[PDB]
Design a protein around this ligand. Structure first.
Ligand code: BLA
Ligand code: BLA
Lengths: 516, 538
């Protein structure tokens, strides 16, 4: 593929954390094909000995009494001599696997989750703004998890990320408003996190615990761990955290109708374990954030569409009065521009092209109109930097930074478009984007960024991104160009009664030659 | 416009249900001025003698210990020698009001609450549709509350509503599929329910306990009960509930966006009392359901509008393929009809109107267009019925029952409209709506309906409602219509090349006016050829 950062498989690591013990059951005969190598403390027997025997005589006597509801719903609490343990059950890779982990110790915690979900679902939330919703979710995440530093991470088109908001406690650095390279998150990571919503790495210094046996005898590969929540992450990502200085990690993915909208991040300077109940409560909390944001964007787009219609109102009303379309646009050009938020407009109906406001030279516009012919689009065209697609205008980007074009007609040569100037924008990177990874002699792998200090770069010949409202405003301008062009048709309609008058002029000079 | 069902107030009854006990406080030292008459058991002292004295000695010592957290949070579970109670505290009418209610005897209900929450939100919820979401909500509400019958009530424009889905229990009657008159819920009821979502009527035949004293001295009014959740409903609604035979009621309000879009009702045939945590858990269910309904509706409507644009596309392309607009519409008359789903399409660009599909004759549509010109509509005018508004075409309601129209020009007489035939449907009424109420002798109050048997009636000369996608499709029809108006600009240049041979004919008019003036030059030339003759004669 592109790099070792992607070709590396994540399913087949076969690494398990030291917190719990993983056990496996094979079909009806209850075969323990693969077991953890740290089961001596819990199971009281050597790990290698337990291979190949039945589940009837190996497990502690307690949890068969709890086996029924474990097979029913996959969760319970069981008492053990070492202490209270949390039991989860899931079946994957054509085999049944069982695991045990420590559980909570504060019974008062459970009602807190209900209280906080009530607070979040309570009305008047989101009216304050979209941005504050992320912070008022992150602060509650801090309270539930009790971690140190929490960011909110949002994905861009090219899979690079930004920090929309964060909530921390005093005494640590913050990455608010910082961007990160797209390659920092591998593609296989996105594919895996599409299915598994959450994950937990409570220690960074811990060595991975080997899985015995190394490979399943008949599968030919080690046991899959995607379904389990105790998987050990790749060692490469560990050095990234260690250089970052984080000891414990906890991330929850946000899903929007099949799209990885963003990730919640949590960090800690010291190792700290966390229970399954807290994880699931946090997951339930994060699930409603997508719905809240959906409601917010529906309301915002409704307001924007209403505002665009309101602005369309008087522009259409003024058109149709005394004058011609070229006269009307020239006289009423002030109200034209704000529909698309541009600085110049151009229309081509068959005559010489007409320009209003800031625009490229007269000779260039028809060259562009010809240039727009072959690119396949049906209604609209978009660009934030036309210089890539069309080099000649990149020489003078003062008005050619961004263009929005629309088909007034079918594939024939009739078009209208708008122009935008360039806006300076400066962004701050964490490390050098040019060197996302630090190479090592021997090319065994690619080490992560050496440092994490803020670094700034400036982009030029770029226009602010086209919104979604102006895309509909283009169709609105088409619906307003009708009406004014229909008044053109009405003035041509009394030119049509003047065509009846022209036939009257025909037979008028007819009876005039009759008279002379 | 207000019958007797809109005069009496609800928040000034001053009645409290049998199970509860009400207490109110005034002033920084929090003296006692309002107390229920059934407080003999819990307080152990005559109610009258305790009002106006120091609050600390009146309240039991156990309750006074946990005052601090109850003051802030407002909810608390406490233990009494009689049993376990839940204390509710709230502020209303500039007064401190606390409440005492029996507590729940079930320890682990909250785990079930979280289980139902995670069931509803789901990794994938409501993929099937809205109706399935309502059905899922109904039976979950039943399970969480343990009631017999539940309702889902949705309001129309005129505040008259029908039931969509229900969770139905065996061995008892249901109400799914009928409508209820808007008179059932008065304006005052909607105004009150706009704020308080939780309404519980523990008993139907219980008599409200009076609050001594009847009137607050400084205010001159009965103590407000809107803030509290133990209000006693008006006796007329108690009789209305008794007529059904239902004993206990539970009503949740689905306030999605500043409006009472939906009401969730629960019924039971036997006395029953719920716990406060039950109501609090059920409260978030309504918000979840409303939010998911809104999200699903928006997503589905956006997806359908995408298909509308996708169908708009090839219509525009094909219409721009041929250069005979009237003929193209005639041959492609099928396609234009399903853009808004109408059956009769009429085009009027100022010339002779074009008629395709089922439509009335030209004179009726011309008269309708003439009437539409002074009729004020900003961009569009859509209605399902026209006989109510326009008399002359009411006779021809077969095809002119409903129409959707848009204004092509900003002014004048350029209108494009469609035609829709009448659609017949049957609405089932629970009880005859023609007799909404029965008047008692003396006209003191209007008692509710007597019998609730199903009743039927038929609506006529009506068309299905123009749902918003149709209006969006008409606007998109104008938007892609500008495409065929650029094709009509090619046709405009065809009319203008007729006018261009007419402009060459205008230059012809110039030099033929020169010709028809210089033929008079030959006229005065003949006059000159005669002028020496007439001079010789003279
Ligand atoms: C190709 C390997 C590799 C390099 C080099 C690189 O840049 N990424 C990487 C390793 C992996 N990272 C994995 C996990 C992972 N990394 C991030 C990155 C961030 N952490 C932040 O808080 C932050 C900022 C903002 C970013 C962009 C994240 C979010 C993840 C997911 C899990 C958490 O770290 O929480 C990873 C996956 C391994 C596995 O799932 O076992 C790889 C391969
Ligand atoms: C004059 C008002 C009035 C007449 C007459 C009438 O038709 N109803 C009525 C009395 C009131 N009822 C009030 C509350 C109330 N009524 C209903 C009605 C229904 N219950 C159903 O199951 C159902 C169906 C649908 C209908 C039509 C409902 C749902 C409520 C809210 C509380 C519950 O009953 O659950 C009322 C409000 C004042 C008060 O609280 O006393 C009036 C005036």
């Amino acid at each position: 593929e592109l790099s070792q950062c992607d070709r590396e498989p994540i399913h087949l690591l076969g690494g398990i954390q030291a917190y719990g013990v993983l056990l496996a059951f094979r079909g009806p005969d209850r075969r323990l094909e693969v077991v953890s190598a740290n089961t001596q403390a819990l199971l009281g027997r050597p790990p290698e000995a337990l291979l190949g025997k039945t589940a009837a005589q190996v497990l502690p006597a307690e949890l068969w009494a709890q086996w029924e509801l474990l097979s029913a719903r996959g969760a319970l609490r069981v008492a053990l001599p070492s202490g209270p343990y949390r039991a989860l059950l899931h079946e994957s890779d054509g085999l049944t696997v069982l695991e045990l982990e420590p559980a909570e110790l504060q019974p008062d915690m459970e009602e807190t989750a209900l209280e906080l979900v009530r607070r979040l679902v309570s009305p008047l939330a989101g009216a304050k703004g979209t941005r504050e919703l992320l912070q008022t979710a992150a602060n509650t995440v801090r309270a539930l998890t009790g971690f140190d530093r929490v960011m909110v991470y949002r994905f861009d088109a090219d899979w690079h990320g930004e920090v929309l908001a964060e909530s921390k406690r005093e005494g640590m650095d913050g990455f608010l408003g910082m961007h990160f390279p797209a390659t920092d998150i591998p593609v296989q990571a996105r594919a895996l996190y599409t299915r598994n919503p959450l994950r937990l790495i409570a220690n960074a210094r811990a060595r991975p615990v080997p899985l015995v046996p190394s490979v399943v005898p008949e599968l030919g590969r080690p046991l899959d761990l995607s379904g389990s929540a105790l998987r050990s992450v790749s060692p490469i990502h560990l050095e990234y955290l260690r250089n970052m200085g984080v000891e414990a990690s906890f991330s929850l993915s946000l899903l929007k109708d099949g799209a990885l909208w963003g990730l919640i991040a949590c960090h800690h300077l010291a190792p700290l374990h966390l229970s399954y109940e807290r994880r699931r409560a946090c997951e339930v909390l994060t699930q409603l954030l997508a719905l809240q944001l959906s409601s917010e964007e529906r309301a915002a787009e409704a307001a924007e569409d209403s505002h665009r219609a309101a602005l369309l109102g008087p522009l259409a009303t003024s058109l149709g009065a005394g004058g011609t379309l070229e006269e009307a646009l020239a006289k009423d050009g002030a109200r034209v521009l704000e529909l698309t938020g541009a600085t110049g407009a151009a229309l081509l109906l068959g005559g010489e092209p007409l320009l209003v406001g800031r625009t490229p030279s007269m000779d260039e516009v028809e060259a562009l109109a010809a240039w727009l012919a072959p690119q396949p689009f049906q209604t609209s065209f978009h660009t934030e930097r036309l210089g890539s697609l069309y080099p000649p205008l990149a020489a003078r980007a003062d008005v050619a930074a961004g263009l929005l074009a629309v088909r007034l007609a079918p594939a024939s040569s009739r078009l209208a478009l708008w122009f935008r100037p360039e806006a300076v924008r400066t962004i701050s990177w964490a490390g050098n984007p040019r060197k996302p990874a630090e190479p090592e002699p021997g090319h065994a792998r690619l080490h992560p960024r050496g440092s994490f200090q803020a670094w700034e770069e400036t982009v030029r010949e770029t226009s602010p991104a086209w919104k979604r409202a102006d895309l509909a405003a283009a169709e609105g301008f088409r619906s307003a160009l009708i009406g004014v062009v229909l008044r053109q048709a009405a003035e041509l309609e009394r030119l049509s009664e003047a065509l009846s008058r022209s036939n009257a002029e025909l037979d008028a000079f007819g009876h005039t030659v009759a008279h002379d």
